[PDB]
Scaffold this motif. Structure first.
Motif, PDB file in Angstrom:
ATOM      1  N   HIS A  52      43.170  30.864  52.094  1.00 42.40           N
ATOM      2  CA  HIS A  52      44.051  31.538  51.441  1.00 42.40           C
ATOM      3  C   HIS A  52      45.116  30.707  50.725  1.00 42.40           C
ATOM      4  O   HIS A  52      45.477  29.890  50.941  1.00 42.40           O
ATOM      5  CB  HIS A  52      44.958  32.552  52.655  1.00 42.40           C
ATOM      6  N   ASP A  53      45.373  31.673  49.443  1.00 45.45           N
ATOM      7  CA  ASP A  53      46.087  30.868  48.374  1.00 45.45           C
ATOM      8  C   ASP A  53      45.677  29.323  48.040  1.00 45.45           C
ATOM      9  O   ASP A  53      46.520  28.508  47.609  1.00 45.45           O
ATOM     10  CB  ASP A  53      47.586  30.838  48.987  1.00 45.45           C
ATOM     11  N   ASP A  93      52.863  33.171  56.119  1.00 53.14           N
ATOM     12  CA  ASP A  93      53.983  33.294  55.211  1.00 53.14           C
ATOM     13  C   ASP A  93      55.532  33.255  55.801  1.00 53.14           C
ATOM     14  O   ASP A  93      55.401  33.885  56.962  1.00 53.14           O
ATOM     15  CB  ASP A  93      53.628  34.440  54.485  1.00 53.14           C
ATOM     16  N   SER A 145      52.556  27.541  50.313  1.00 51.23           N
ATOM     17  CA  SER A 145      51.434  28.343  49.627  1.00 51.23           C
ATOM     18  C   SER A 145      51.907  30.037  49.469  1.00 51.23           C
ATOM     19  O   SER A 145      51.008  30.711  49.694  1.00 51.23           O
ATOM     20  CB  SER A 145      50.618  28.349  50.827  1.00 51.23           C
ATOM     21  N   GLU A 146      52.923  29.998  48.642  1.00 48.67           N
ATOM     22  CA  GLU A 146      53.145  31.312  48.178  1.00 48.67           C
ATOM     23  C   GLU A 146      54.393  31.194  46.960  1.00 48.67           C
ATOM     24  O   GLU A 146      55.133  30.361  47.252  1.00 48.67           O
ATOM     25  CB  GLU A 146      53.868  32.478  49.070  1.00 48.67           C
TER      26      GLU A 146
HETATM   27 MG   LIG Z   1      49.823  34.363  49.688  1.00 51.24          MG
END
Ligand SMILES: [Mg+2]
Ligand code: HEA
Ligand code: HEA
Ligand SMILES: [Cu+2]
Ligand SMILES: [Cu+2]
Ligand SMILES: [Cu+2]
Ligand code: NA
Ligand SMILES: [Zn+2]
Lengths: 43, 514, 261, 79, 58, 227, 84, 47, 98, 84
Positions: free
Chosen positions: B368-369, F173, F197-198
C-alpha cells in the motif's frame, strides 16, 4: 480503407518542416522555463 | 455561422468533435505535468525547490488525465460521435442538454487551473483527504477551487449519463432489441449507469469537505466528533466505480477493433461479453475498501473486501479470452489500430494481474502507498485507457474527418510509445517491492537506478506525443479523402460515408420484425 | 436533408447551454469570492444569469411542446426516462448524507462523550413540530394525487383547487421548518450533530422549495390551459419529484429526528 | 491484585485494530472508581488497575486534554 | 380565464425562420441580449478576480 | 532496508514478513503462469494463414474459462486469508509503545511504568556523519527489545501519516483521534528503517522511522537514560 | 398503531378528494392542535463551554463571523457564553 | 440548417492552408503543453 | 361535483404530435414509430421498404436471436437481397411523395 | 454495499432468463461455496443448568416427553445435562 490520392500532397521536405515546427513548439517554451529554474529557486 | 454551429450546437457530431478537441488539449497539460514529475525524480536531490509545488503537480496530473482527458474523449467524444450512428438515431435524446455537458468542462478546467495559481495550490493528492485538505493544513481558496471544479465536472457527466442511457434505451429501431446493439453501445450504457450512481456520492462527500472548511461543520474533524475515515469511505465508494468507468468504454472499442481487423462479422461470445461488463459494473460497487487496508478496519471486513475484489477477475477473464477467441481464424490486417488493440490486451492483462496481488489485504499492508500501486494503475490506465483511445482514434479518424492518416507514421508512433511507457513503468514494480513510498519528491540513494531509467522512459513517450501531433497535421495537410470502407454490413457507423452528413438518419433505417 | 420520417425532436441551436455553463462558473467562483475575499458580487451575478437561463430554457421547452407540438409519443417516453434517472441520482446524493449521519451516530467518539446525542445537545421533540411537518407533507402527497386525477378526468376547477392545497401545504412546511431552524438550541457549528442535522434537512428543505416552485409553474401552466387530459408530462414530473421530496423527509424523520435523538 | 504489571493485556471487549475505546473506557472507569472510593470514604487502591492500563494505552496528549477538561468541567464523558 | 393556446400555436409555428428562443418577439431578443451580456461581463469580471488572487495581495 | 538495484522485498526481519515473502512468491508464480499463457495464445492466434471467419459456438469453452480462474483464485485467497488472520492474531505483548505522527516528525511514548517521551527527526543530509544514510537517519531512534512482542499504537496529532517499516511487515495509518494497534516482533537485533506512508504535506518525504533492536537488558538502561 | 378505514383508498378523483378532506387535512389540524397545545418554550439550556460545540475553525463569511446564520440569542450561546 | 458538409468542413478550424493549420495546431497544443511549466514558474516566483 | 374545462388532444395537439396522432387512427405509420412486419422475402413477395427518397438503409436481423444486424442501402430499382440471407427487399415511395 | 449492473433488469423473458442464469444462480453457488468453506462444526457448548432454558412445564406429547422434536444429542442437552 482506400483513399483518393492526396489533393495537396505533402512532399518530404514539407513534412520535415512540419515535424520540425511541431517538435519545437513543444521543446522551446519548456526548455526556457527549465533552463531558468535556478533564477526562480534562488528567489 | 461559427456561433450557431460551434457554441449553440445541438448536433451530436459537432459536440463529439468539441469533446475530442478539449480532451486533446487537456492531454497536453497532463503530459506536461507528468514530465515535471519525472523531471524531479530523475536525479537524487530536489529540482522544483519546494515539495509543495511537487505535490501540487502530482495532484493536477491526476485530475487532468482522469477528468479532463480520458472521460471527455472516451465518453463525450467517441460516445457522442458513434452511439447514435451505431443504433440509427438522428441525434441524442436531449441535444440541447448535451451541449451543456460539454460547456461545463472549460469552466471546470479553469477552476482547476485557478486553484494551482492562487495561494500555494492544492498539494493534497487526487484523493484530497482531510485533514490535509482541511482549512488548517490547506488554508485558502485552492482546495475550494478544486472542489468546485469537481462539482462542475460531476454535473456535466451526470447530465451526460442521463442522455446516453435515455438515448440508447429509447431511440433504437423499433425492431432492434438491446441484445442487437453493438458492444460499444453496451459499454457506454453500463458506464453511464456507473456514473449516474457514483458521482452523486462523491458530490455529497466533497460538499461535506467544503462545509468543514467554510461553515464550521465537523464531518471529518474529530474535534467535533467527526471522522476523517468517513471521507475515505464516501470518496472511494465513488472511486472504484470511477476506475471501471475509465476502462469500460475502452473494453467496448477494443471489441470493435479486434473484430474488424480480424475480418469477422461479430465478436466471439457476444452475450458472454455483455454479461461480463454488467458483472464488472455490479461488483465494482462493492469492493471500495480495498483502498483502505491500512486504515484500521476489523479483520473480518478486510477479509470480505479482498474476497470480493478477487471475483472481479472471473468476468474480466471471459473478456480477455473472448478477444483472443475473436482473433482465432481471422484474416488479420496489421493496421495501426489493430496494433494498439493487441498491446492493450497484453498490457491490461499485466496491470490487472498486478491488481490481484494488491487485492490481498495481508500483502497490501506492505505494498500500500508504495510505487507498486503506481505501477499497477499506470499499466491499466496509461496502457489500457490510453491504448484503447489511440486505437479507436486511428480507426475512426477517417470517419470523423473524411481523410486518412499515413499508416506508416502511425506504426512508427505506436512502436515508440510502446517502448516509452514500458521503460517508464516497468521499473516502478521494483521500487515498490523494495519500499519506495508514493508522493515523495526525493528518495534514499538506493532507489536511484530505477528512478533514473523511469524518468528516461518518460521522455521517449514525450517524443511519441509530439510525433502524434504531426501525424494529425500531415493527414489534414495532405488531404487524401476516403473512397471505400470494408465491412460496412456489420459496421453501421460507416454507412453514411466519411464524414457523415450533419444530419444522418433523417429517414430512419428499416428493420423487419421477422 | 429531406423531410424527417422519424418521430424525434431536433432542437434549434440554443445559447442556453452556454449561458447555463457560464452561470455555473460565476456561482462557484462567486462562492469562492464570498468565502475568502468577503464579496458577493460575482455570486450575485451568477445567481441572476442562472435564473435567466432556467427561465428561458424551460420557456422554450414549453414553446416546443405545447405550441409547436414536437412532443410526439417517442419524445415523451424519452422525457420520462430522463426524469426518473434524474431522481435516482438525487437519491444517491442524499444517500451520502444518511451515511454520514449513521456513521457518526452509531459510533460516537470520545470527544462527544462517547454517546449519541453528544453530551451538551438538546434535540427537538419528534412529537411536536416534526410530527406536524410529517403530516403536512404526507397530506400534500394525497392532495397532489387528487389533482392528478382531476386532470385526467378533465376537471379543471378541482385540478386547480387540489393543486392549490398541495402548494399551500408545501409552503406551510417551509415556514414551519424555518421557524424550527430559528428556535433550535443547537447550530450547524455544534459538532457532528449540528453538522449532520443541518446539511441533511437543509438540503431537503432546499428540495422542498424547488418542488414548490415546480408545482407553482404547473399551476400557472394549467391556468392557461397548457395541459390536456392526456398530455401533461410537466405535471407528472412535478408530482414524482414531490413524492421523492416526501419520501426523503420520512427518512430524515425516522433517522435523525426519531431514532437519532 | 496486580502491580507485577508489564503492560495492558489483551482485552476481548476491544479485539480489533482500533483501540480508541480501550483507552477511553479505562480512563473513564478509573476516574469513576476514584470518585466512588473517595465519595464513600474508601480506598482508591482498587482503582489503580485502570490507571495503569489507560496510562499505558492513552496518548499523553489525550490524557492531558481530558484532565484539563475535567478541571474546567467540560469533560463530555459522564464521570 | 380563457383558452388562448391555439393563438400561441400559430405565432410559434409561423414560418419566420426564427429559432424558438427568439420566435416569440422583440422581448425574447432583449432577454437574450441581457443574459449574454451579464454572462460575458461577469465571466470577464471573474477572470480578473482570478488574476488579482493569483498574486500575493497582502 | 533497501540496497541499490534491488528487485524484491527487503529481507524479512520478522516472522509475518517471512510469511509474506513466501505468499508473494506463490502469487507471482501464478501471475507468471497466466501472463505467459496469454502471450503464447496471442502469438498462436496471429501466426497462421488458416482462416475460419464464419461463426463459432459461444458457450462450450466459456465454462473452462470461468471454472479455471475460480479455482486459481481460491488458491490465492486461502493462504492470503490465513496470513491476514495471523497478523491480527491474539498476541500477549510485553511492552506497549505509542507513536504520534506530527507535521514532520514522529514522537514516541513508552509509558507502561515511566513517562518516557521523545521526538524523532530526520538528520539533515548536511549533518550526516560519513556512512550515514541520506534521507533515512533519524536523530533519536526508537529502541525496543529484540525477540519480544511489542504492541505499537499509532495515532497522529495533526493530519494523517502512516507509520511503516517494510522489513518487519508493518504499515498502520496514523489518524487524528484514533489509536490503531499493530504487533511488532523482531527476530534479530539491528537497525531497521521505514518512512511516512501517507501524504502529509510539504515534508512528507522527510520523516523516516528508525528502529533499533537490542537485548532487553540494554533496552532498560536506555529507558532510564532517556529519563 | 396500524390502519384500516374500510375500503376506498384508491381510484376516482372523487375518492382522492374524499381522502384529502376527510383524512389528510383533518390529520393536519390535529397535529396542529397538538403542536400548539404542547409547544410553549424550552427554558434556555445552561451554558457550559464544551469544546465539541460552538465550533469555529474559520469565521463565517457574514456579519461578525461569530454568529451562525439563524442565530437565536435566547437559545444559542456564542463560544463565550450567551449574548444578552 | 445550411451548415456546410464534407471533408474539412465539419470542423471549427479551417484546413484550407496546411501552413496556417501548422500554426494553429502549434499554438493549440503548444499552449496546452506550456501551461504547466509556467504555473510551476509562477509558483516559484511568489517565494 | 364535476365540470370539465381541460382540453383534449383531439382538440389541442398540434404539429408532429397531431400528425402522428391522426395518422395512427387510419392505421398508418409515416413516422416510423412501429416495427414493420416481414413478408416471405421471396422475389415475388419481397419486403416493401417505403422511402421518401430513392434509397433507405435496411437492417436485416436474419434470424430471431441474432446479435448482429446486417446493414445495407436498398435502392430504387429492382429487389435487392440481404448479403447474408438473400431475403428480398424492394423500395417503394413513402406517403409524403419525395 | 450497493448495486448497479448496467441496464436490463426488467422486460423480456430472455432478460429474466439472462438474470436467472447470469446473476441469481451464480449467487447461490457463491453462497454455497462460502457456506461450506466456513461451515465445519461448533464445539458443543458447556452445559450450565440455567433456569430460563430447557423449559418443561408440561411434557412433550411424544417419545419420553423430555426430548424436543429435532433433538440433537451432540448439541442439545436435556435439563439434566447432555445425554451421552
Ligand atoms: Mg495511504
Ligand atoms: C483502468 C482502471 C483500473 C482498473 C481496470 C483496475 C483494475 C483492478 N485494480 Fe486497480 N487501481 C486503479 C486503476 C484500475 N484498477 C487506480 C487508479 C488505483 C489507485 C488509486 C489511488 O490510490 O490513487 C488502483 C488501485 C488498486 C488497489 C489499491 C491498492 C493500495 O492502494 O494499496 C487495489 C486493491 O485491490 C486494486 C486492485 C484492482 C483489481 C483487482 C483490478 C481488477 O479489475 C483486474 C482484473 C483483471 C485481470 C485479473 C486480468 C485479466 C484476467 C485474466 C487473464 C483471467 C485470469 C486471472 C486470474 C485467475 C487471476 N487497484
Ligand atoms: C488516465 C490516467 C493517467 C495517465 C494517462 C497517466 C500518465 C502518466 N503518469 Fe500518472 N498518475 C495518475 C494518472 C495518470 N497518469 C494518477 C491517478 C496518479 C496518482 C496521483 C496521486 O498520487 O494523487 C498518477 C501519478 C503519477 C506518478 C506518481 C507521482 C508520485 O507518487 O509522487 C507518476 C510518476 O512517475 C506518474 C507518471 C505518469 C507519466 C510519465 C505519464 C505518461 O504516460 C505521460 C505520457 C502521455 C500519455 C501516456 C498520454 C498521451 C495521450 C494523449 C495526449 C491524448 C491524445 C488525444 C487524442 C487522440 C484525441 N503519474
Ligand atoms: Cu478500487
Ligand atoms: Cu507524514
Ligand atoms: Cu507523510
Ligand atoms: Na527529486
Ligand atoms: Zn438478412
Amino acid at each position: 480503407i482506400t483513399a483518393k490520392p492526396a489533393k495537396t500532397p505533402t512532399s518530404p521536405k514539407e513534412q520535415a518542416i512540419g515535424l520540425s515546427v511541431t517538435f519545437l513548439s513543444f521543446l522551446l517554451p519548456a526548455g526556457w522555463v527549465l533552463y531558468h529554474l535556478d533564477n526562480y529557486k534562488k528567489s | 455561422m461559427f456561433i450557431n454551429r460551434w457554441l449553440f450546437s445541438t448536433n451530436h457530431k459537432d459536440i463529439g468533435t468539441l469533446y475530442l478537441l478539449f480532451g486533446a488539449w487537456a492531454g497536453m497539460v497532463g503530459t506536461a505535468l507528468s514530465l515535471l514529475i519525472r523531471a524531479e525524480l530523475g536525479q537524487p536531490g530536489t529540482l522544483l525547490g519546494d515539495d509543495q509545488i511537487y505535490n501540487v503537480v502530482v495532484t493536477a496530473h491526476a485530475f487532468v488525465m482522469i477528468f479532463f482527458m480520458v472521460m471527455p474523449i472516451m465518453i463525450g467524444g467517441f460516445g457522442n460521435w458513434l452511439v447514435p450512428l451505431m443504433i440509427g438515431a438522428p441525434d441524442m435524446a436531449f441535444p440541447r442538454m448535451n451541449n451543456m455537458s460539454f460547456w461545463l468542462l472549460p469552466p471546470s478546467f479553469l477552476l482547476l487551473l485557478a486553484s494551482s495559481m492562487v495561494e500555494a495550490g492544492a498539494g493534497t493528492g487526487w484523493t484530497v483527504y482531510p485533514p490535509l485538505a482541511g482549512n488548517l493544513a490547506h488554508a485558502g481558496a485552492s482546495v475550494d477551487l478544486t472542489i468546485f471544479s469537481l462539482h462542475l465536472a460531476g454535473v456535466s457527466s451526470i447530465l451526460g449519463a442521463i442522455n446516453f442511457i435515455t438515448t440508447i434505451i429509447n431511440m433504437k429501431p423499433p425492431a432492434m432489441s438491446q441484445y442487437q446493439t453493438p458492444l460499444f453501445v453496451w459499454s457506454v450504457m453500463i458506464t453511464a449507469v456507473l456514473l449516474l450512481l457514483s458521482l452523486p456520492v462523491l458530490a455529497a462527500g466533497i460538499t461535506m469537505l467544503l462545509t468543514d472548511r467554510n461553515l464550521n461543520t465537523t464531518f471529518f474533524d474529530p474535534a467535533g466528533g467527526g471522522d476523517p475515515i468517513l471521507y475515505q469511505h464516501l470518496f472511494w465508494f465513488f472511486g472504484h466505480p470511477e476506475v471501471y468507468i475509465l476502462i469500460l468504454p475502452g473494453f467496448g472499442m477494443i471489441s470493435h477493433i479486434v473484430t474488424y481487423y480480424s475480418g469477422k462479422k461479430e465478436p466471439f461470445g457476444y452475450m458472454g461479453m455483455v454479461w461480463a461488463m454488467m458483472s464488472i459494473g455490479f461488483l465494482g460497487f462493492i469492493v471500495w475498501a480495498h483502498h483502505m487496508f491500512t486504515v484500521g478496519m476489523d479483520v473480518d471486513t478486510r477479509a470480505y473486501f479482498t474476497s470480493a475484489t478477487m471475483i472481479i477477475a472471473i468476468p474480466t477473464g471471459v473478456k480477455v479470452f473472448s478477444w483472443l477467441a475473436t482473433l482465432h481464424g481471422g484474416n488479420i490486417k496489421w493496421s495501426p489500430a489493430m496494433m494498439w488493440a493487441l498491446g492493450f490486451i497484453f498490457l491490461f492483462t499485466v496491470g490487472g494481474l498486478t491488481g490481484i496481488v494488491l487485492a490481498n489485504s495481508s500483502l497490501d499492508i506492505v505494498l500500500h502507498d508504495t510505487y507498486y500501486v503506481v505501477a499497477h494503475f499506470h499499466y491499466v490506465l496509461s496502457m489500457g485507457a490510453v491504448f484503447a483511445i489511440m486505437g479507436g482514434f486511428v480507426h475512426w479518424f477517417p470517419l470523423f474527418s473524411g481523410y486518412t492518416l499515413n499508416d506508416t507514421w502511425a506504426k512508427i508512433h505506436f512502436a515508440i510509445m510502446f517502448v516509452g511507457v514500458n521503460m517508464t513503468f516497468f521499473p516502478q514494480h521494483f521500487l515498490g517491492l523494495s519500499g519506495m513510498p508514493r508522493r515523495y519528491s526525493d528518495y534514499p540513494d538506493a532507489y536511484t537506478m530505477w528512478n533514473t531509467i523511469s524518468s528516461m522512459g518518460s521522455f521517449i513517450s514525450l517524443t511519441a506525443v509530439m510525433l502524434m501531433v504531426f501525424i494529425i497535421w500531415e493527414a489534414f495537410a495532405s488531404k487524401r479523402e476516403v473512397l471505400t470502407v470494408d465491412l460496412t454490413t456489420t459496421n453501421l457507423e460507416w454507412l453514411n460515408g466519411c464524414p457523415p452528413p450533419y444530419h444522418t438518419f433523417e429517414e430512419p433505417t428499416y428493420v423487419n420484425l421477422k | 436533408m429531406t423531410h424527417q420520417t422519424h418521430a424525434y425532436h431536433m432542437v434549434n441551436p440554443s445559447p442556453w447551454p452556454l449561458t447555463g455553463a457560464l452561470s455555473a462558473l460565476l456561482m462557484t467562483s462567486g462562492l469562492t469570492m464570498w468565502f475568502h475575499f468577503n464579496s458577493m458580487t460575482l455570486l450575485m451575478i451568477g445567481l441572476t444569469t442562472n435564473m435567466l437561463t432556467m427561465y428561458q430554457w424551460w420557456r422554450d421547452v414549453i414553446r416546443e411542446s405545447t405550441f409547436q407540438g414536437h412532443h410526439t409519443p417517442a419524445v415523451q417516453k424519452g422525457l420520462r426516462y430522463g426524469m426518473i434517472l434524474f431522481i435516482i441520482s438525487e437519491v444517491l446524493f442524499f444517500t451520502g448524507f444518511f451515511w454520514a449521519f449513521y456513521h457518526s451516530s452509531l459510533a460516537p467518539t470520545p470527544e462527544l462523550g462517547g454517546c449519541w446525542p453528544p453530551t451538551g445537545i438538546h434535540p427537538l421533540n419528534p412529537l411536536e413540530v416534526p410530527l406536524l411537518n410529517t403530516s403536512v407533507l404526507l397530506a400534500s402527497g394525497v392532495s397532489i394525487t387528487w389533482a392528478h386525477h382531476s386532470l385526467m378526468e378533465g376537471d379543471r376547477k378541482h385540478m386547480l383547487q387540489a393543486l392549490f392545497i398541495t402548494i399551500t401545504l408545501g409552503v406551510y412546511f417551509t415556514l414551519l421548518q424555518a421557524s424550527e431552524y430559528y428556535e433550535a438550541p443547537f447550530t450547524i457549528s455544534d459538532g457532528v450533530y449540528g453538522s449532520t442535522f443541518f446539511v441533511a434537512t437543509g438540503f431537503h428543505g432546499l428540495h422542498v422549495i424547488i418542488g414548490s416552485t415546480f408545482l407553482i409553474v404547473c399551476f400557472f401552466r394549467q391556468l392557461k390551459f397548457h395541459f390536456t387530459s392526456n398530455h401533461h408530462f410537466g405535471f407528472e414530473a412535478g408530482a414524482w419529484y414531490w413524492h421523492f421530496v416526501d419520501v426523503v423527509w420520512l427518512f430524515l424523520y425516522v433517522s435523525i429526528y426519531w431514532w437519532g435523538s | 491484585k496486580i502491580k507485577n504489571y508489564q503492560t495492558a493485556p489483551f482485552d476481548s471487549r476491544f479485539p480489533n485494530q482500533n483501540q480508541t475505546r480501550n483507552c477511553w473506557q479505562n480512563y473513564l472507569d478509573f476516574h469513576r472508581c476514584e470518585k466512588a472510593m473517595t465519595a464513600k470514604g474508601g480506598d482508591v487502591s482498587v482503582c489503580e488497575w485502570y490507571r495503569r492500563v489507560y496510562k499505558s494505552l492513552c496518548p499523553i496528549s489525550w490524557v492531558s486534554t481530558w484532565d484539563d477538561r475535567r478541571a474546567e468541567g467540560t469533560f463530555p464523558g459522564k464521570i | 380565464f380563457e383558452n388562448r393556446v391555439a393563438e400561441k400555436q400559430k405565432l410559434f409555428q409561423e414560418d419566420n425562420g426564427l429559432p424558438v428562443h427568439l420566435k416569440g418577439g422583440a422581448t425574447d431578443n432583449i432577454l437574450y441580449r441581457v443574459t449574454m451580456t451579464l454572462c460575458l461581463g461577469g465571466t470577464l469580471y471573474s477572470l480578473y478576480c482570478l488574476g488579482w488572487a493569483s498574486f500575493p495581495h497582502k | 532496508m533497501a540496497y541499490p538495484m534491488q528487485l524484491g522485498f527487503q529481507d524479512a526481519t520478522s516472522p509475518i514478513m517471512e510469511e509474506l515473502l513466501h505468499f508473494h512468491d506463490h502469487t507471482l508464480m501464478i501471475v507468471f503462469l497466466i501472463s505467459s499463457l496469454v502471450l503464447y495464445i496471442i502469438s498462436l492466434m496471429l501466426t497462421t494463414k488458416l482462416t475460419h471467419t464464419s461463426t463459432m459456438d459461444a458457450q462450450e469453452v466459456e465454462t473452462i474459462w470461468t471454472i479455471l480462474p475460480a479455482i486459481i483464485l481460491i488458491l490465492i485467497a486461502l493462504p492470503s486469508l490465513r496470513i491476514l488472520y495471523m497478523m491480527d492474531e491474539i498476541n500477549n505483548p510485553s511492552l506497549t509503545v505509542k507513536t504520534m505522527g506530527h507535521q514532520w516528525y514522529w514522537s514516541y511514548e513508552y509509558t507502561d511504568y515511566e513517562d518516557l517521551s521523545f521526538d524523532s527527526y530526520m538528520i539533515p543530509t548536511s549533518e550526516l556523519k560519513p556512512g550515514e544514510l541520506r534521507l533515512l537517519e533519524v536523530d533519536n531512534r526508537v529502541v525496543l527489545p529484540m525477540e519480544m512482542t511489542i504492541r505499537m499504537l499509532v495515532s497522529s496529532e495533526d493530519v494523517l501519516h502512516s507509520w511503516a517499516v517494510p522489513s518487519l511487515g508493518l504499515k498502520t495509518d496514523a489518524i487524528p483521534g484514533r489509536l490503531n494497534q499493530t504487533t511488532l516482533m523482531s527476530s534479530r537485533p539491528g537497525l531497521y528503517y521505514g518512512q511516512c506512508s501517507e501524504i502529509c504535506g510539504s515534508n512528507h518525504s522527510f520523516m523516516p522511522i528508525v528502529l533499533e533492536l537490542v537485548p532487553l537488558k540494554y533496552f532498560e538502561k536506555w529507558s532510564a537514560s532517556m529519563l | 398503531a396500524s390502519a384500516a378505514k374500510g375500503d376506498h383508498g384508491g381510484t376516482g378523483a372523487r375518492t382522492w378528494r374524499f381522502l384529502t378532506f376527510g383524512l389528510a387535512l383533518p390529520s393536519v389540524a390535529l397535529c396542529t392542535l397538538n403542536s400548539w397545545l404542547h409547544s410553549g418554550h424550552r427554558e434556555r439550556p445552561a451554558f457550559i463551554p464544551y469544546h465539541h460545540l460552538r465550533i469555529r475553525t474559520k469565521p463565517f463569511s457574514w456579519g461578525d463571523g461569530n454568529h451562525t446564520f439563524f442565530h437565536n440569542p435566547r437559545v444559542n450561546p456564542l463560544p463565550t457564553g450567551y449574548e444578552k | 440548417s445550411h451548415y456546410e458538409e464534407g471533408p474539412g468542413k465539419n470542423i471549427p478550424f479551417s484546413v484550407e492552408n496546411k501552413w496556417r493549420l501548422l500554426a494553429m495546431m502549434t499554438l493549440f497544443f503548444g499552449s496546452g503543453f506550456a501551461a504547466p511549466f509556467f504555473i510551476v514558474r509562477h509558483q516559484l516566483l511568489k517565494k | 361535483a364535476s365540470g370539465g374545462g381541460v382540453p383534449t388532444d383531439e382538440e389541442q395537439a398540434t404539429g408532429l404530435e397531431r400528425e402522428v396522432m391522426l395518422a395512427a387512427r387510419k392505421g398508418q405509420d409515416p413516422y416510423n414509430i412501429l416495427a414493420p412486419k416481414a413478408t416471405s422475402g421471396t422475389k415475388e413477395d419481397p419486403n416493401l421498404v417505403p422511402s421518401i427518397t430513392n434509397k433507405r438503409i435496411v437492417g436485416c436481423i436474419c434470424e430471431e436471436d441474432n446479435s448482429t444486424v446486417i446493414w445495407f442501402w436498398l435502392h430504387k430499382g429492382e429487389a435487392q437481397r440481404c448479403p447474408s440471407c438473400g431475403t428480398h427487399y424492394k423500395l417503394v415511395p413513402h406517403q409524403l411523395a419525395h
